[PDB]
Each structure stands twice: as structure tokens, then as C-alpha cells.
Amino acid sequence: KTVVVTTILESPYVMMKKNHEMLEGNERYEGYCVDLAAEIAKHCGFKYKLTIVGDGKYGARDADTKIWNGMVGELVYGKADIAIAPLTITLVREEVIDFSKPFMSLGISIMIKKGTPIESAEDLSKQTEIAYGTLDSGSTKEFFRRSKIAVFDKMWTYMRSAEPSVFVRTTAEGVARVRKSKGKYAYLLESTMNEYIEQRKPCDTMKVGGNLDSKGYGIATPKGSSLGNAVNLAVLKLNEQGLLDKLKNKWWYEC
Amino acid sequence: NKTVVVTTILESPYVMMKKNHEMLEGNERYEGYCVDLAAEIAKHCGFKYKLTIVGDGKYGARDADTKIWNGMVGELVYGKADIAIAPLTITLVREEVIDFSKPFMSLGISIMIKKGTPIESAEDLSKQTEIAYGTLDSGSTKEFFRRSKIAVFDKMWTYMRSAEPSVFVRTTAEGVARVRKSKGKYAYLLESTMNEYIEQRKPCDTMKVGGNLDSKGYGIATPKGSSLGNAVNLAVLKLNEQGLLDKLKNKWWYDGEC
Numbered sequence: 001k002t003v004v005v006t007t008i009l010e011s012p013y014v015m016m017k018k019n020h021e022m023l024e025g026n027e028r029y030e031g032y033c034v035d036l037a038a039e040i041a042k043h044c045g046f047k048y049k050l051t052i053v054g055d056g057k058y059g060a061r062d063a064d065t066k067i068w069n070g071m072v073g074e075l076v077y078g079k080a081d082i083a084i085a086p087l088t089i090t091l092v093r094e095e096v097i098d099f100s101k102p103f104m105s106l107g108i109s110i111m112i113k114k115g116t117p118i119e120s121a122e123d124l125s126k127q128t129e130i131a132y133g134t135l136d137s138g139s140t141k142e143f144f145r146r147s148k149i150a151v152f153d154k155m156w157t158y159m160r161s162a163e164p165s166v167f168v169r170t171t172a173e174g175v176a177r178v179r180k181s182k183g184k185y186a187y188l189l190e191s192t193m194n195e196y197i198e199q200r201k202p203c204d205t206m207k208v209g210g211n212l213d214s215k216g217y218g219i220a221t222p223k224g225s226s227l228g229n230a231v232n233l234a235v236l237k238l239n240e241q242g243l244l245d246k247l248k249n250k251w252w253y254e255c
Numbered sequence: 256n257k258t259v260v261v262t263t264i265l266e267s268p269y270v271m272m273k274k275n276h277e278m279l280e281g282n283e284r285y286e287g288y289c290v291d292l293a294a295e296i297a298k299h300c301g302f303k304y305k306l307t308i309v310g311d312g313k314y315g316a317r318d319a320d321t322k323i324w325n326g327m328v329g330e331l332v333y334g335k336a337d338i339a340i341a342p343l344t345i346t347l348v349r350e351e352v353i354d355f356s357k358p359f360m361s362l363g364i365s366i367m368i369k370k371g372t373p374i375e376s377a378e379d380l381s382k383q384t385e386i387a388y389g390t391l392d393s394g395s396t397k398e399f400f401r402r403s404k405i406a407v408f409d410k411m412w413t414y415m416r417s418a419e420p421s422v423f424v425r426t427t428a429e430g431v432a433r434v435r436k437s438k439g440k441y442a443y444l445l446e447s448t449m450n451e452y453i454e455q456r457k458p459c460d461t462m463k464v465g466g467n468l469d470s471k472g473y474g475i476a477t478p479k480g481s482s483l484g485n486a487v488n489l490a491v492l493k494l495n496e497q498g499l500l501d502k503l504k505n506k507w508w509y510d511g512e513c
């Protein structure tokens with residue numbers, strides 16, 4: 001009956017509307033993914049329930065318990081029927097779930113507090129005074145972990161052992177750390193967020209250099225899911241009619 | 256174990272004739288981005304393959320009259336080719352009849368002009384008629400403008416479909432030659448990938464202006480219900496994550512006559 005949608009609370013994808021306290025159900029939320037979910041549901045003709053992933057994670061497989069967490073986990077163990085959020089299409093995930101073609105293209109990038117003397121990944125790698133890290137249980141950490149590229153390889157050996165920990169549990173925590181570390185902390189995140197934050201007060205962060213790779217976000221469903229193929233056609237249609245660019249301009253519409 | 260028939264297309268730097276092709280046989284006649292990818296794909300998946308240039312030299316579209324598919328898409332649809340490894344754009348009409356792996360390259364529609372031409376964006380193009388402009392036939396780009404309800408693009412399509420002489424070209428090479436020979440009176444709408452490649456080729460007289468009109472990607476394609484599909488998709492994502500696809504792009508794109 002009601003499709004259970006798992007998504008994550010990350011502006012401008014999903015955020016609490018003002019005065020949400022007296023609101024109920026899906027009306028409590030607004031954002032890029034909120035509108036996209038509505039679109040998908042409208043064209044596919046089904047009711048749905050937005051639910052914030054319990055642990056607030058994107059999705060990774062515990063190196064020990066070998067159990068998947070985050071939104072990926074919700075789909076794998078059957079808690080959600082579909083994930084509609086900025087979930088990165090990767091090999092280890094495609095091995096356990098299905099993704100539609102990307103509804104957004106992006107790449108890993110570098111966020112620094114304005115004034116920080118670093119222009120690129122090469123810059124970060126050769127020094128240590130300026131610390132840097134990424135999010136836990138995400139596609140960025142994994143990217144560096146599996147990279148054999150000298151540049152990105154060096155960076156990993158540095159992060160994997162840095163103390164105190166350069167890793168963060170949430171993205172909002174990685175941004176907050178840059179803003180508060182007087183230039184001693186650079187953050188590695190996806191271009192999408194780096195751009196969003198650069199146009200926000202106190203307008204003290206910025207993206208430097210080009211992206212380190214080219215990937216995309218896809219709508220995810222349990223492996224061999226029935227809704228899968230239909231959702232993919234729906235998404236390609238929305239993109240081709242220019243609605244997805246419209247949504248992007250709307251939510252990425254200080255500094 | 257059977258030799259996999261791979262349909263591809265002659266579009267530099269994806270698939271090009273090697274300098275000594277006249278005295279060479281089969282796959283050794285070609286070189287390029289896609290030739291290298293086909294090799295990488297074939298290696299990991301463990302199978303032998305035969306590169307075959309698509310007979311009509313087209314990408315793929317369904318005929319408005321006969322309703323028959325042509326190009327590489329046609330090769331897959333009618334069972335002539337087992338797989339397509341080329342810069343084939345992932346699109347709705349195609350996904351309806353064939354399968355695509357996830358993108359091995361990202362791009363968007365762009366504007367190529369003869370340097371010095373007074374045009375900076377699609378909006379500029381649509382607001383005048385002194386400078387003609389068109390696109391490639393039987394491809395995703397022409398279909399984009401035909402189905403766009405966006406003011407600018409809609410207006411651009413209204414002009415193009417009725418222009419005289421025709422503003423459409425059969426191959427990308429033809430589009431580039433027209434830009435170069437028309438003294439600035441013709442602008443060509445094509446995918447950023449090809450536009451940036453040409454910008455680095457002699458006589459270095461063309462250039463991309465404005466930003467992409469959309470965002471999409473190229474994907475390896477297989478017939479619907481193909482056992483190769485899923486496996487090749489994972490193989491491509493792997494190559495992508497290891498950076499092999501970016502190194503491959505550098506090689507054939509920037510490793511540059513300008």
C-alpha cells in the first residue's frame with residue numbers, strides 16, 4: 001500500500017518546515033528530495049511515507065559485523081521500499097541494491113575556510129599543519145580507501161592515522177569544523193554541498209580546485225525490486241523535461 | 256564461448272582508424288578511447304570480442320515513418336550486435352528498448368562556434384537569424400530540442416526544423432567542417448565532450464561558449480534481457496572508481512594540438 005521512503009535530513013534536500021510542530025506526516029518536510037519524491041509518486045501513482053533514516057547515515061558495511069547501516073541498510077534489511085536522497089552510486093552498493101540513472105551529477109571536492117593556503121588535493125597531501133578528513137560511512141571515505149592513485153593514496157594513509165580523528169559523523173559536523181578551525185582543517189565533500197555552503201552566511205568557506213572524480217546520485221531500491229525499473233524511466237523523463245534542473249535552481253537559488 | 260559482437264562508431268577520439276590500418280586485420284585496425292575501454296571491459300569479463308563499425312554510421316533513433324530503429328541502437332534491437340561500446344547517450348526512448356550501464360562519462364549539450372563569432376549562449380542564438388545553427392541527425396541532441404518545453408530551446412527547435420537549407424548534419428565531422436567554412440555564419444550544437452576535443456585540434460579555430468544546456472552521460476549498452484548487462488555495469492563502475500576512465504580521457508583528449 002504505502003511506499004516507505006527513506007531519506008536523510010540534509011538541507012536543501014530534506015529539512016523541517018518552519019512551525020513543523022503543528023504539521024503532520026510528509027507535510028512536515030520540504031526540500032529538493034521532498035519535491036522529487038512527490039514527483040516520482042505522482043507519475044508512478046502510489047502513496048508514500050517519508051521517514052528520516054534512524055542512524056542518520058548514508059550507508060556502509062561495518063568492517064566487522066559486516067552489517068550495512070544507514071539508508072543502504074534500510075533497503076537491504078527491508079525497512080524501506082525506496083531511498084530518495086543524495087545517495088552516491090557506487091560499486092559496493094550496486095552489489096547489494098539497485099540505483100536508477102543519476103538525477104544529479106557531482107564529484108568529490110575540497111572545502112576550505114577563506115584564506116587557507118591550499119589550491120588542490122596535491123596541496124593538502126604534501127603538508128600536515130592543515131588537517132583534513134571526510135565523512136564516516138560514506139562514499140568519499142571509501143573512495144580514498146580504495147584509491148591506488150599516488151595523490152589520493154597519500155591522503156588516505158594520512159587520514160587513516162591522523163590524531164585527533166579527522167573524520168566526522170555528519171556533514172554538518174565537517175562544515176562546522178572548517179568554520180571553527182581557523183584554517184587548520186580542510187574538508188573533503190561532494191561538490192553539491194560545497195557549492196551550497198559557499199552561498200550561505202557567514203560566507204566564510206569556499207571550494208578550491210576542480211572535482212576529484214565524476215559520479216552521481218541515484219534513487220535506490222532493494223535488489224531485484226519491482227518498483228526499480230519504473231522509477232528509472234520516471235527519473236530520466238523528469239530530467240529530460242528539465243524539471244530536475246528546475247528543482248536544483250529552486251533549492252540552490254547572502255554572500 | 257562465443258565471440259562478442261561489439262557495435263561502435265567512427266568518432267574520434269573514441270574509435271579511429273590506425274595509421275597502418277590498410278595492412279591490418281580485425282580489431283588491430285582501430286585505436287581510441289572506446290577501443291581501450293572495450294579491451295579493459297573484455298579483459299575483466301573474460302571474453303573475446305569483435306569490433307564492428309555500425310553500417311549506417313548513425314547513433315540511434317526510431318524512424319518517424321517506418322518506426323524502425325537505426326544506428327547502434329538498431330544493431331542491438333534487431334540482434335546484430337551483442338553490445339555497444341561507444342559514446343552512446345543514455346536517454347528515455349532508448350532505455351525503453353535497450354539497457355544501459357551507469358555512465359562512464361558525464362556531459363551536456365553545448366555550443367561550438369568559429370572563434371570571433373558574436374554568440375555567448377543559446378539565448379543569443381535564439382534571438383537572431385543571421386547566424387544559422389543546427390545539430391546531428393538521429394541523435395540524442397536533435398531529440399532534446401524536439402521535446403523541450405523550455406522557452407529558449409523550444410524557440411530554437413521551431414527555427415531549426417524549418418530552416419533552409421537544412422541545418423542538420425549526418426556526422427559530427429560534417430558539423431565541424433560547416434562551422435569552420437561558414438566564416439562565422441553557422442554554429443553547431445553538440446555534446447561538450449566532442450566540443451572540447453575539437454577545441455584542442457588544429458587549426459584551433461573553434462571554441463565552446465556558454466554552459467551546458469543539460470546534464471547526462473554515456474553508457475555501455477546491451478539488448479534487453481542480456482546476461483552481459485549487470486556484469487559489465489559493475490566492471491565499468493570499478494574502472495571508474497580506480498580512475499582508469501579519467502586517465503583514459505586525459506590520454507585521448509589532453510595528451511592536444513593547441
Ligand SMILES: N[C@@H](Cc1c(O)noc1-c1nnn(Cc2ccccc2)n1)C(=O)O
Pocket residue numbers: 010011012013058059086087088134135137138139140141171188189190192193194196
Ligand atoms: N553522498 C555520499 C555522502 C558524502 C560523502 O561520503 N562525503 O560527502 C558526502 C556528501 N556531501 N554532501 N552530500 C549531500 C549533500 C547535502 C547537502 C547539500 C548538497 C549535497 N553528501 C554517500 O552517499 O555516501
Ligand SMILES: N[C@@H](CCC(=O)O)C(=O)O
Pocket residue numbers: 314315342343344391393394395396397444445446
Ligand atoms: N551522443 C549522441 C550523438 C551526438 C549528438 O547527438 O550530439 C547520441 O548518442 O545520439
